Homo-oligomer: A and B are copies of this chain.
Amino acid sequence: SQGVIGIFGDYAKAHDLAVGEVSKLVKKALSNEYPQLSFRYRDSIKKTEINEALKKIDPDLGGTLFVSNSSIKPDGGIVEVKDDYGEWRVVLVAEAKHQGKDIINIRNGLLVGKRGDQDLMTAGNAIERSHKNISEIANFMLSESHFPYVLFLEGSNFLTENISITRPDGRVVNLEYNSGILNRLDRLTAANYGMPINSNLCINKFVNHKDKSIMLQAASIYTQGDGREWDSKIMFEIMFDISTTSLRVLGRDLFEQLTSK
């Protein structure tokens, strides 16, 4: 609703854009807001690129590479901006994951389990793989003071409120979100150090314990806690907000370009 944001947002909703297309929409919106800056979208980053960023931090880092052409491909891609030095800086990395088919199985009156007599499927743990790409981007951005990694959760395994699903035969199945039978949210909280979910954690926090003053890279973790599908318009707003925050942290290195125009 924030001017053009409202407009782009309606477009995303009208086309139920996938997270990757929403990232491309964020890039376009950024270019619109900041005509003097240069933005780009990339769907992947090579492991050699990460290693090079790591080496700049410390020569002993980023020394391993078993498969030469190895890489990562966040399903939401990556958006970057060119700084006054000509270097590309990450402003957004988005990822959307799914897990838990219970709401669909119930609506279909389809029992599950090895005996096909269960209303619910004990939730799996594949979502844990999400920590790998978060770690890869944190490493790639180790020199940065922001970490614009956003993860969108969807499914019966990421509930934040109790919901009710009615079977075809009319029987109603009540789901308690705090049930370990299905809730796998605690499998992702390590990624943002237990900070609040559904929040923009792009600005890195620094902490200490022994005159340490260490930097934390917290992913912003969002979930559609009612088991429904994500609204592309809200994903767009979340993502545009994160990206805007990236630009703020990167401000000192964008001044020259905002001037000369």
Interface residues of A (CB under 8 A from B): 47, 50-51, 54, 57-58, 60-70, 125-126, 128-129, 131-132, 134-136, 138-139, 142-143, 145, 160, 177-180, 183, 185-187, 189-191, 193-197, 205, 207, 209-210, 212-215
Contacts and interface: CB of A to CB of B under 8 A. Distances in A.
Contacts of A212: 213, 215
B132 A190 contact: yes
B131 A194 contact: no
A250 to B, nearest CB: 13
Contacts of A129: 125-126, 128-129, 131
15 contacts: A57-B209, A61-B193, A61-B194, A62-B194, A64-B189, A65-B189, A68-B178, A128-B128, A129-B131, A131-B134, A132-B187, A132-B190, A135-B191, A139-B190, A214-B214
Contact of A57 (B57, B142, B207): B207
A57 to B, nearest CB: 5
Contacts of A195: 60-61, 63-64
B139 A70 contact: no
A135 B57 CA distance: 21
B125 A196 contact: no
Contacts of A60: 195, 205
How often does this chain occur in the complex, in copies?
A: 2
B64 A197 contact: yes
Given A126-B126, A135-B191, 6 more contacts: A51-B194, A60-B195, A61-B193, A66-B177, A67-B180, A142-B209
A190 B139 CA distance: 7
A191 B134 CA distance: 11
A187 B64 CA distance: 11
A215 B57 CA distance: 12
A191 B215 CA distance: 16
Nearest to A160: B66
A138 B117 CA distance: 40
Contacts of A189: 47, 64-65
A64 B194 contact: yes
Nearest to A185: B66
